[PDB]
Write a protein that binds this ligand. Sequence first.
Ligand SMILES: CCCCCCCCCCCCCC
Ligand SMILES: CCCCCCCCCCCCCC
Ligand SMILES: CCCCCCCCCCCCCC
Ligand SMILES: CCCCCCCCCCCCCC
Ligand SMILES: CCCCCCCCCCCCCC
Ligand SMILES: CCCCCCCCCCCCCC
Ligand SMILES: CCCCCCCCCCCCCC
Ligand SMILES: CCCCCCCCCCCCCC
Ligand SMILES: CCCCCCCCCCCCCC
Ligand SMILES: CCCCCCCCCCCCCC
Lengths: 55, 55
Amino acid sequence: FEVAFLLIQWYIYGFSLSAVYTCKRDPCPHQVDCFLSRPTEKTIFIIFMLVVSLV
Amino acid sequence: FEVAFLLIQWYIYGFSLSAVYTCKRDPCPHQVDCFLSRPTEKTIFIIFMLVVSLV
Ligand SMILES: CCCCCCCCCCCCCC
Ligand SMILES: CCCCCCCCCCCCCC
Ligand SMILES: CCCCCCCCCCCCCC
Ligand SMILES: CCCCCCCCCCCCCC
Ligand SMILES: CCCCCCCCCCCCCC
Ligand SMILES: CCCCCCCCCCCCCC
Ligand SMILES: CCCCCCCCCCCCCC
Ligand SMILES: CCCCCCCCCCCCCC
Ligand SMILES: CCCCCCCCCCCCCC
Ligand SMILES: CCCCCCCCCCCCCC
């Protein structure tokens, strides 16, 4: 289960977050720029949890 | 002068107007859709003036 969850997380998200996201889904016209909340703290916590899982 | 003005108008605009315009100039992000005012009456008047100039 540990390995499966780690692989799924790696495939879907990764281990980092960026502040700006580009969206190309309807009904948005041709493109849209969107902005996230607290994109730096969450990376730190993600890394912490990754280390715990590996241990 | 008549011929020169007709050629310039043909090169720059044409002889019609569309209701939706696509803009890709900064600072607009990646693209923008814009909408015009009275895009059908102006075509009629443009055609009238073209006919007058040719006559
Ligand atoms: C341990 C339980 C994990 C559940 C696995 C079921 C498959 C998860 C989705 C796989 C990715 C889907 C991409 C479209
Ligand atoms: C700029 C942010 C870079 C983050 C990339 C992911 C780094 C993962 C670090 C893993 C180190 C710990 C391994 C045991
Ligand atoms: C964009 C820069 C992000 C900075 C990442 C620093 C993460 C530090 C995590 C340390 C985890 C240690 C686990 C024992
Ligand atoms: C500023 C760039 C930071 C690059 C990522 C930092 C996290 C990697 C170190 C992880 C600590 C591991 C402790 C066991
Ligand atoms: C991030 C990966 C951590 C791996 C180290 C985990 C501790 C293993 C200790 C090895 C010594 C075994 C003594 C019983
Ligand atoms: C009869 C007076 C007409 C003036 C002609 C001067 C040139 C007009 C501009 C030509 C097109 C410029 C495209 C960058
Ligand atoms: C759907 C709008 C079509 C407009 C295209 C321009 C047509 C020009 C008509 C010229 C006819 C008169 C020539 C003497
Ligand atoms: C998109 C459809 C626009 C309809 C264009 C009709 C223009 C009629 C102009 C007639 C001019 C006659 C000059 C004598
Ligand atoms: C509905 C489509 C209309 C196509 C353009 C109509 C304008 C062309 C006729 C111009 C009249 C010329 C009179 C001398
Ligand atoms: C749209 C172009 C109009 C061209 C016709 C202009 C009238 C020319 C009449 C030709 C007969 C000459 C008799 C002197």
